[PDB]
Each structure stands twice: as structure tokens, then as C-alpha cells.
From a paper:
Wallerian axonal degeneration is strictly reliant on the NADase activity of SARM1. It is therefore intriguing that the endogenous ortholog TIR-1 does not support WD in C. elegans, despite its demonstrated NADase activity and overall high sequence similarity to SARM1. We find that a series of interlinked molecular alterations in SARM kinetic properties, the order and strength of oligomerization, auto-inhibition, and regulation by nicotine nucleotides set the two orthologs functionally apart. In conclusion, our investigation into the absence of WD in C. elegans has revealed that while hSARM1 ectopic expression in C. elegans neurons leads to axon degeneration following nerve injury, the ceTIR-1 does not. Together with structural and enzymatic studies in vitro and in cell culture, we have determined that the stronger NADase activity of hSARM1, particularly its lower Km value, is the fundamental reason behind its ability to induce axon degeneration, whereas ceTIR-1, with weaker activity, fails to do so.
To determine the ceTIR-1 structure, a construct lacking the non-structural N- and C-terminal regions (162HMD … QQR872) was expressed and isolated. To determine the 3D structure of ceTIR-1, we first performed particle picking and unsupervised 2D classification and averaging. It revealed that, like hSARM1, ceTIR-1 is also assembled in a two-ring structure with an inner, scaffolding ring of SAM domains and a peripheral ring. However, unlike hSARM1, ceTIR-1 is mostly assembled into 9-mer and, to a lesser extent, 10-mer (class 8) rings. The peripheral ring clearly has a different conformation in ceTIR-1, where each ARM domain is separated from the neighboring ARMs and extends perpendicularly from the SAM domain’s inner ring. No symmetry constraints were applied, and a map with an overall 3.5-Å resolution was produced. Eight of the nine TIR domains are packed in two slightly curved rows of four, with antiparallel 2-fold symmetry along the long and short axes. The ninth TIR domain is docked on one ARM domain that is positioned completely different than the other eight ARMs. In stark contrast to that, the ceTIR-1 TIR array is readily assembled, without the need for NMN to release the TIR domains from ARM inhibition and without NAD+ involvement in stabilizing the TIR active array. In conclusion, at least in vitro, the portion of ceTIR-1 particles that do form ring oligomers are assembled in an active conformation with the TIR array pre-formed even without NAD+ and mostly free from ARM inhibition.
Residue numbers in the entry:
A (entry chain G), B (entry chain F): 194 to 695, 707 to 849
The structure:
């Protein structure tokens, strides 16, 4: 499998993770409504998504795992557990069903560990035992039960205390008409046997489980038979229980069942149930290959490891068999006289092949020059690798590259070759993880905004940009400092800040008939001293009378009221606030403007002050400037003092 | 056939598909009225279009198929089915007829599969059996019947349960006068026999069908005879049924009927009926070439395969005979002592010739360097191919090319060579599918806007443009980022975003005798300022006063009122809205015009403002301009400011 494919996988993973995180959040909004149909629909969407994820060509396992992690990280998993185990869920069993199905999809090793750490284990087990009303409930029950049985020996042994084995027996005995029940039963038995001590195995066997595994291995369903063969061969792998399985006759079915199948053919049937098979479950199956075990057990183990090798080739994770050392046991079995086992082991070793030179870390800033060399080589620029080495290019340096650097320091002459190269580098830039350095999850943010914007991450990050600062950038800063020359991309992120939401110094109020002199004079005089001073002289707009007359007051810090003879007279009995000086002054009072009356020399307050409306009457008590034409400069200085405080 | 022709075909296909999709939509808008003449006319147009499509020089089959797909995709096909089978259609059987004729054109393999998937099959069958009232009904009936008989064995067998065979017999027996009836009968018999199991074949034969096929093969019509010869030779190809045909002279007619024709002459005759001939129908005919079958059956099969080879040469799909392996059976027959069959088989093999090196995928971004090399070669740039290879050019890179890249990295020195090359590349760009990457069918949108604009698709798509954003682009973004340097093309898409929304600009209201000279001057001054400004004097014609006065206001955005010594006067107590200035101003308010009073130099509002009707009273509290004759230019500047903000 190529480095182009390593990149494509990483890229796809990051991309679809970002996408499915968002879609999962939407589905979790329907869950978080806490309404039956919405929880059902949300869980249905999550279920569909998780299955589609598992059906994704090769990143399926990683993408499933990452979403299982995200479910824990978001507490979505915790919420599902609570909204499954809660007795209130009896209001609609279909809510419990959909929650349970999702939990089934999400029962990763780390999710089961979470369940154990939070001690939900027995609650979930009992609630699975309560899921019994229909074959669907029974299948889901046996599934969740069997999934709990993928945790360590102590947990399985603790769960034996529930006597769920008898519940399992009764479940398949009730509804053998469903092959999927027989599958989930045989699965549960395989899992518990694989994940239990000698004592617990003995307790399981006492429930006539070898004879029930004979029953299961006698069914028409190859997946049930596969699990039944694994389960009995797990028992057979223990010396003292071989006679009990011999008495069950199941070993006599085992090898013929394997003989009439091929692991890779069975893989295509088994895929739906192969999804979620894991390293520690392989580590526990590995002992069944050993020459100490029965030919039957060795044959099952060999067939199984070939099947897994097939799947792990597709996943590009054949390394697991080297990590657990299974390759040695396969060689032993391939050399053994157990022809069936030896064939399957030889076939498994045929699938094993050879290692990758490097698995590249998605944290590409951490790349050594050796990594860059390998990448460059594999993307088909071999003749330049020596020059990259000579230039001592590293992960960080790659991310900074421009065509000039190629043109000059790499000496890479073809513009076309540069285009080609840069396309790969852009792909890589998008694909790369930055969480190594991105404290702010700016990468995640950009991906969410649009995936390609990932390309800019490292530049802006290294310029010291972070997720909080994005609000504050000009198109210039973006374009130049962050190098986002594409205006389309700039527009996209601009839309984020367009959607992230949701001055006058002095207003002059005056009498239009008489304050006209003093007010505009004040306007002009204040325009000397650098104040923005505004007044309804020469300015009105937008048709129906301009509400600017109050908006301009709201924007103003200071409110000057010109008081000329009889200026206040029309405010008398203006209780309906019809007078515009009233509207202006009321607005000033409501918005706590720094209000200054300026008294013309001839001004006098109205005799009937009590007739001034209550909301504005306070103006008769206010702090103001008696305007004296003789002392205009001093009067204006006083006005400025009231403005400056 | 050249790659230039592959491109021309692909181009034409994409082009005419876009066109005929739009035309089909128009016809479907007539159908969607659910009114007899509109359904009839729409279906008539679709029928004409489908026949014209079938008459299209090369791409006929693909274009027909793509439109059959589009019909399903648009649910147009579903609508036709419903509007055919519905009992309400008995209101006008001509509706059912036109729907049925269109369905006949549109009964591709996938369309028949749709019918089967939706279980409409028996409903359509029975309704076809009800189409019996005229020779036209009978022909269409036998057609739809025969078309249903081109689905797989189980469907044909299920339709035998209707005893439609007796209906078929009675139909042609009723109307022997019509060659087209005899054709659709012989077709239905050929199809059902070709698409049925042994048991169903036996049931068909029991309806005296060999003797009816004698009758049909005895008729003067060569197309009826062809189908009759195929039908009997289908029966003759089955061991137990040779005597059931041999009871009749039909095999004795068969070879002489072939002998007096040439497959290519018959192709030109049969064309009308040669349309729609599937691979699957060929796959079922292939066994009739085998040396196990009669000389008659081998002769029919050989003649037929020559005829089909003739048509598939024209359609550029000779590959079918390699895919189904018919070439081997033709070689066997060509080697056989069946001289007539051997001649036709030799002629068929003469037509077969040799394969194309590549059939290019219209998804040209997916092209390998090998594909580009092949393209470059075939467009007549062979001497550069090695340089393209050396430059490692791919599908994506081709789409990015500029003359600079040719000039430098290809070292294509002739500007003329570049022009020539770019012309082909533009053609290819237009022709190419992008749906591989275009989530939004922006390609389709651009094509619909104008086909050549396809040229820009890949650039803007790779810049991250999508169908939603197009509204929002500046001429700069278009020109520069999207590279649409042709302003004409920019204008075209500008028209699209103009018409993504949705003349007198300013109306002048006045009291006639006092707005007068000023009102007129306002028109003149605003016309000097470029506004199309009109007045009460101008816009009264050939009818009632209101009915010409007011319409100007709705089309205007801006509404000036000249306020004057009798402006508002006649509005007082005008509760019945009798005053024309009232009607004008009310209309302005109702349609939210940005209304601006212009106060004459000696203007006063009515002090008895409370007598102004409530719907227009707001005008006394409006943003206006005091006209002062001495400052006419400043006043008009102010008017412009109120208009523009």
C-alpha cells in the first residue's frame, strides 16, 4: 500500500471525522431535546452513520474508533448510557432500543473501559436482560451482553454472578427462528469464554454450554457455527474441559465446518460481524494455535487468523500479527502435521507478506528529513530526494515550501513538476494533524468552516494566530500574513465573522425657529476643537421622518440643549411627547447622556414649570452655560469643561 | 473512430442532454398542469424529442438512455405511469395514449426495472389490454406489452398469468390491415419467447403460436417477418419444440426470407424499430448461433448479429460483441457449412474489425498520464507526447494548462500550435463531466446558463466555488480568481444573478396649479441628474384617471411630493380618498416608497393636520427639502441625497 494511500487514508479519516462529528452533533441535538421521536431519530441517524463508517473502504476502524472517542469526549456516550439505563425510558421502549443499538455500535475497547470505570457495567447488563420482549430486543440484548464480555477476566467473572448465561440460553431457546439471535448468542459465549478465568469457564460449562454449542454448531448459519466453533475450541484449549466438549460431540463438527469454507470467502459473509474485531481479542485467540492444543482448536485458530489477516490487509494493519508475535505460531502450525490448520496458517502467512518502510505520523511537523525523503520518493520525485537530503528539509520546512524554494534550492525546473508537487503538498497540508501544536483547535475550527482551509493552518499558526484572534483579522492580514491569496477562501472565513455577530461626540438639540443661531454657531465652534458635533441643520434622511434624530443622540456621548427665548414653551403639556425637542431630550435622559443646557442671554424658564412633562422636567434643575456673545470664547471653554468633565 | 470524435460525441451528448433536459422540463410543466391538452401537447413534445434524439447521428442511444434516467430522477417517469394507469384518465383516452407513447419511448432496461421495482407491471399490462378501441390503441398496447416482455424470465412468466397472449392473438386478428400491429405483435412474441423459461415457452406455444408465427411470417411486411422468424427460431432453438414449429411451413419461409435481404439494407429499413436494442436481448439471442441449433436459427441469428453489428458500428459500441463473446460464435458459424449463416457471420466479423485503445471517461480529471498521452497523440500533437510523459501531466493538470506551460514546460514554441491546442482543450473542458467532484451540479448550472461556461467549471470548482456562492461574486473575483477574463461571459453570469432577484424611478405628486412650474422643473432637473422622472401631466391615457396615474408609483422606487399653497389642502376631510394627491400618496405609503416632501419657499403645513386622513397624515412628519429658488442647485443636491440615502 502506497504513501499516496497513507496520505489518502489520513486525509479521508480527518475529513470524514470532521464531517461525522458535526452530523453526530446534529443527531445529539435531537437526543438532547429529550423527546421520544427525536431521541429515536437522532439515535437512528447515529446508528446509520456508525454502520456507514464501518462500511467505509479502509479507514472504517480508525474512523469508528475516533467517533467512539468523540462520543466519550462530548459525554454523548455517557448521556446515551444514562438515557438507556434510566427507568423513565419505560415511557417508550423504542428510545431504549435506539440508544442500545447506538451503544452496541459504540462498544469500542475504550468505551467498554469507560463503562467499567464508571461502574455502569451491571446496570447495562440487567437492562440488556430486560430487553427481552421481541427477537429484536433479544438480539440487541445478546449483542450488548456479548460486548460487555469483551472486557477483561474480572469483569466477565463479575457478570457471571448475574446468571445471564441462563438468560442467554432461554433467549436462543425462545427465538431460534432468528439466525441473528443464534449469532449474538454464539458471539456472547465465544466472548465470555475468551475473556474469563478457569473458574468462570467452569461455571459457564456447568450451564451445559458445550451441549448448547453443539446445538449452535448444528445450525445452518455459518456465522453462528464459526462463533460456536471458537467458543468450544476456547473450552477445548483447557485440558480438563476437552472431555466435556468430546461428550458434546462438537469437536466432530468443528473441522468439517472449517473444511467446507475458505477464510476469505467467509470474510465476505462475516464482514458485518468482523467490524469491531480487536487486537486483545486476537491476543487471547493466539494460544489456540499452540501445538499444546487440539488439532480442532489449532484449525479454528488458523482459519480465524487467516480471516483476520484478510481484514487487516484491507485495513493496512497487518503489523498487529508481528506485534502480538502470531506470525511465529502460524509458522509452527504451517510446519505442523495438522493439514487443515497448516493450510490456513500457510494462507495466513501468504497474506502477511512484508512490512511498510514507514508508517507516517499525521503530525507531519514532527517529520525528520528521513520521513520527508520517504514521502518525496513515494510521491514520485525520487531524483530530487538527494537534494532534499542535502537541503536538510524537515516536517516544518516542508510546510513552509513555496515554488521558489523548489525552483532555486531544490533546482526543480519544470513548473509542471512544481504544480504536481505542490498539489501533493497541499493534500498533505490538508491531511496533516496539527494538534501537536494547535492548543486552540484552530485546525478543527478551519476544517469545520471548510476542510480545504486546513491548508492554511500551519502558516497562520506559526504566525501566532489562534482560534480566538480570527475575529480580528483584516482581509490584508489574511491575504498577506496568512498567505490566503484565494479571495474565495477569504470570503468563506469572512462569512464566519459576518455571522459571528448575532461616532458622534455631541448632539445639539435646539429650537428650529430661534435656537438656529446659537446651536449652529456651537456646531461650527466645536468643529474647531476636533469634536464630531451634529444637529438637525442641513441633515435629514430615509423618507419617514429620520429616526436619526434619536439614533444620533444614542451614538453621541454628549447632549447640548440650546435654550433661546420661549424654546421650552411648546414642551408645556407635551405629555404625548409630540415635540421633537421633547423626543430628543427624553432620549438623552433614557440613554444617560451628559446633558448640558446652554442658556441664551434672554432665556427664561417657563413660569408654569409644573406643566413640563415629568420625564424631562429635570432639565429645569440642570447644569448649564449662560451663553454671552461678549465672552463667546470663555462660554465655549465652559462648554468644553462640561464635555471633558 | 477518432478521439476527436469521442470528444465530439461526449461534447454533443453533454450539450444536447443539457438542452433536452430543459425542453423536457418545459413539456413536464405542461404535463404538471394536469389538463388534457397540456398533458397531450407536453407528451407529444417529449415523443417528438425522443424520436429526434433517436435520430441524432451517433449519440442517440446514450442520449435516449440519459433522458430515460433523467425522467426517473425527476419522477417525470413516475408521473407518466400514474397519469397512464389512473382510472380518471378515462375522461380523455388521448391523454393515456400520449403518456403511453412517451412511456414506450422511455422504456429502457432501467425504466422497465423501475416499473418492476414499483410493482406497476400488472397495472400497466391490464391498462395496455384496455387500450384496444382503435388500431392505434392496439399498436401502442402490443408495444407496451412487448416492452414489458423485455424484462427477465420471472416477469414474463408472471405476465403469462394474464393470458395476454390470447389478447395479442385477438388484437392482430382484429386488425391484420396494419403492418405496425403485426410488427408489435411479432415483437411481443419474439420478446416474450426470448425472455421466458421452458415452462412459459410451452404455455406460449400451446396458444397455437407456431401457427400464428406461420401467419405472421407469411405476411408481406419484412419487419413482421423478421420478428416472426426470430420468434419461431427461438422456439426451434429448443429441442422439444422443433416439431411444434415443423408442424408449420415457418422454418421453410425463414431462410428464403433472409436470403432475399441484406442485414445492412434491413438495418436501414428496420431503423425505426432498431432503436432501443439492448445488450441483454443480444445476450439472449447469442445461443441461436450455436452449432447445436438448426441451420434456420443459426441463419436468423447470423443475419441479426450482422444487422446489430451494422448499428453498433454507427453507435460506436461494437465492444458489446466482445463483451458477450458473440465474436467466437460468429467465427464458429463463419466456419460452419451453413453457407447463408456463415456468409452473414463472416460479414458480421467484417463489421467487427478491431477495438479502440481507450474509451475515454468523461470524468477527465480522473485521467492518467497514459490517457493524456493518448489524447494529445490523437488530437495531432504526437511530437509532444514524450514531453507530456516526461512532464508527468495528468487529467487535473491538463485542466489547469495555460499557454505559458506549453511555451515553457512543453516547449511548444508556435503560438499557432498553442492556439490550436487550446481550442481542443477548451472543447474538452466544455465536454468533460465534473460530477465526480461537483457536489452541487454547478457544471449543470453553468451549462444551463450557457454551455461554453462549462469551460470555467473546473477552475472555479478547484478554487472552492460552489453553486450557493455564485450570487455573491464580484466582477474582480470572477475575472481574476475564477479566470473569466472574457467580460461577455462575465456579463452573462451577471444577468443570471441580476435575475436571481425578481421605468419611472421618481414619481412627482403635486397639486396641479401650484406644484406646477416647480413640479415641472423638478422633472427637468432630475432628468438632468439622470433620473427617469415623470409627472401627473405625462402619464394619463385612454382610460380612467386612477388606472394610469397610480401605476407609475408602484414601478417608481422614489416619490417626491411638491408641498405648496394647495398641496395638502384638498386632502383635508378626504376620508373617501377622492383627492388624486391622496390616492397618489396613499399608494406611495402602501408600497413603502421612500417619500420626500419638497416644501415651497412660502409653504405651510395645515395647522388642522388632524383633518388630514389617518392613512396619509404621517406626511406632516416626513423628511423633506425646503425649496429656495436662489439655492436651487443645493436644494436639488439635497433631493438627490434623500433619494440616494
Amino acid at each position: 500500500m502506497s504513501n499516496t494511500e497513507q496520505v489518502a487514508m489520513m486525509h479521508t479519516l480527518k475529513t470524514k471525522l470532521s464531517k461525522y462529528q458535526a452530523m453526530m452533533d446534529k443527531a445529539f441535538e435531537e437526543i438532547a431535546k429529550v423527546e421520544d421521536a427525536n431521541i429515536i431519530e437522532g439515535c437512528t441517524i447515529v446508528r446509520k452513520l456508525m454502520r456507514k463508517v464501518w462500511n467505509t473502504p479502509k479507514v472504517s476502524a480508525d474512523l469508528a474508533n475516533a467517533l467512539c472517542d468523540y462520543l466519550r469526549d462530548r459525554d454523548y456516550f455517557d448521556k446515551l448510557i444514562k438515557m438507556f439505563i434510566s427507568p423513565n425510558t419505560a415511557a417508550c421502549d423504542q428510545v431504549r432500543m435506539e440508544c442500545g443499538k447506538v451503544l452496541e455500535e459504540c462498544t469500542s475497547s475504550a468505551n467498554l473501559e469507560y463503562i467499567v470505570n464508571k461502574s455502569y457495567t451491571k446496570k447495562i447488563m440487567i437492562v440488556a436482560m430486560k430487553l427481552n420482549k421481541t427477537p429484536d430486543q433479544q438480539r440487541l440484548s445478546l449483542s450488548l451482553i456479548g460486548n460487555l464480555f469483551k472486557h477483561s477476566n474480572a469483569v466477565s467473572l463479575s457478570l457471571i454472578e448475574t446468571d445471564v448465561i441462563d438468560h442467554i440460553i432461554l433467549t436462543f431457546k425462545r427465538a431460534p427462528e432468528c439466525p441473528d439471535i443464534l449469532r449474538h448468542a454464539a458471539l456472547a459465549l465465544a466472548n465470555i469464554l475468551l475473556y474469563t478465568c478457569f473458574e468462570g469457564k467452569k461455571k459457564i460449562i456447568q450451564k451445559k454450554i458445550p451441549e448448547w454449542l453443539f446445538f449452535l454448531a448444528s445450525q445452518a448459519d455459518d456465522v453462528t457455527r464459526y462463533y460456536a466453533c471458537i467458543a468450544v475450541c476456547t473450552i477445548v484449549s483447557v485440558k480438563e474441559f476437552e472431555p466435556l466438549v468430546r461428550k458434546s460431540d462438537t469437536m466432530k463438527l468443528v473441522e468439517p465446518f472449517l473444511q467446507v469454507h475458505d477464510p476469505a470467502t467467509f470474510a465476505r459473509d462475516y464482514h458485518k460481524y468482523a467490524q469491531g474485531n480487536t487486537k486483545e481479542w486476537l491476543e487471547r485467540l493466539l494460544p489456540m494455535l499452540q501445538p499444546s492444543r487440539r488439532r480442532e482448536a489449532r484449525s479454528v485458530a488458523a482459519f480465524h487468523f487467516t480471516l483476520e489477516a484478510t481484514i487487516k490487509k484491507e485495513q493496512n494493519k497487518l503489523d498487529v500479527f508481528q506485534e502480538i508475535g502470531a506470525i511465529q505460531a502460524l509458522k509452527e502450525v504451517a510446519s505442523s502435521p495438522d493439514e487443515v490448520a497448516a493450510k490456513f496458517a500457510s494462507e495466513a502467512l501468504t497474506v502477511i507478506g512484508e512490512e511498510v518502510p514507514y508508517k507516517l505520523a499525521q503530525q507531519v511537523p514532527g517529520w525528520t528529513c528521513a520521513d520527508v525523503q520517504y514521502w518525496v520518493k513515494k510521491i514520485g520525485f525520487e531524483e530530487y530526494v538527494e537534494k532534499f537530503a542535502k537541503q536538510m528539509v524537515d516536517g516544518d520546512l516542508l510546510l513552509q515550501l513555496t515554488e521558489n524554494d523548489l525552483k532555486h534550492d531544490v533546482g526543480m525546473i519544470s513548473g509542471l513538476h512544481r504544480k504536481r508537487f505542490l498539489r501533493e503538498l497541499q493534500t498533505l497540508k490538508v491531511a496533516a494533524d496539527y494538534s501537536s501544536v494547535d492548543e486552540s483547535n484552530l485546525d478543527n475550527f478551519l476544517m469545520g468552516l471548510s476542510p480545504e482551509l486546513s491548508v492554511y493552518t500551519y502558516q497562520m499558526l506559526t504566525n501566532g494566530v489562534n482560534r480566538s484572534l480570527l475575529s480580528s483579522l483584516t482581509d490584508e492580514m489574511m491575504q498577506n500574513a496568512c498567505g490566503i491569496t484565494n479571495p474565495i477562501h477569504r470570503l468563506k472565513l469572512t462569512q464566519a465573522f459576518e455571522t459571528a455577530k448575532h461616532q458622534i461626540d455631541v448632539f445639539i438639540s435646539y429650537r428650529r425657529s430661534t435656537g438656529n443661531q446659537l446651536a449652529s454657531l456651537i456646531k461650527v465652534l466645536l468643529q474647531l476643537r476636533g469634536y464630531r458635533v451634529f444637529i438637525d441643520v442641513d441633515k435629514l434622511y430615509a423618507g419617514k421622518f429620520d429616526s436619526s434624530l434619536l439614533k444620533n443622540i444614542q451614538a453621541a456621548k454628549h447632549f447640548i440643549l440650546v435654550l433661546t427665548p420661549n424654546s421650552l414653551d411648546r414642551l408645556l403639556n407635551d405629555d404625548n411627547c409630540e415635540d421633537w425637542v421633547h423626543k430628543e431630550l427624553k432620549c438623552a435622559f433614557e440613554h444617560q447622556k451628559n446633558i448640558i443646557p446652554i442658556f441664551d442671554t434672554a432665556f427664561e424658564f417657563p413660569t408654569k414649570e409644573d406643566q413640563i412633562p415629568n420625564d424631562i422636567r429635570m432639565i429645569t434643575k440642570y447644569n448649564g452655560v449662560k451663553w454671552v456673545h461678549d465672552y463667546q470664547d470663555a462660554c465655549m471653554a465652559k462648554v468644553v469643561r462640561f464635555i471633558t468633565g
